[PDB]
Amino acid sequence: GFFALIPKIISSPLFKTLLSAVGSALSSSGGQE
């Protein structure tokens, strides 16, 4: 952390990974295609 949004400011250098993770957990997993 840092002050308040530091964990969100890295949305690009951090969330897109959780998103790539979800894109694989929702597009790959969940759907199972």
CA separation for the pair 20, 2 (Å, rounded):
24
8 CB-near residues (< 8 Å, 6+ apart):
15
The C-alpha torsion from 8 through 10 and 15 to 20, rounded to 10°, is 170
Other C-beta atoms lying within 10 Å of the C-beta of residue 11: 12
- Cβ pair 25, 18 in contact under 8 A: no
CA separation for the pair 33, 18 (Å, rounded):
20
Give the C-alpha distances (Å, rounded to integers) separating 3 from 9, 16, 18: 11, 21, 21
Name the structure determination technique.
NMR
- Cβ pair 7, 1 in contact under 8 A: yes
Q: Is 30 left (phi over 0), alpha (psi -120 to 50) or beta?
A: left
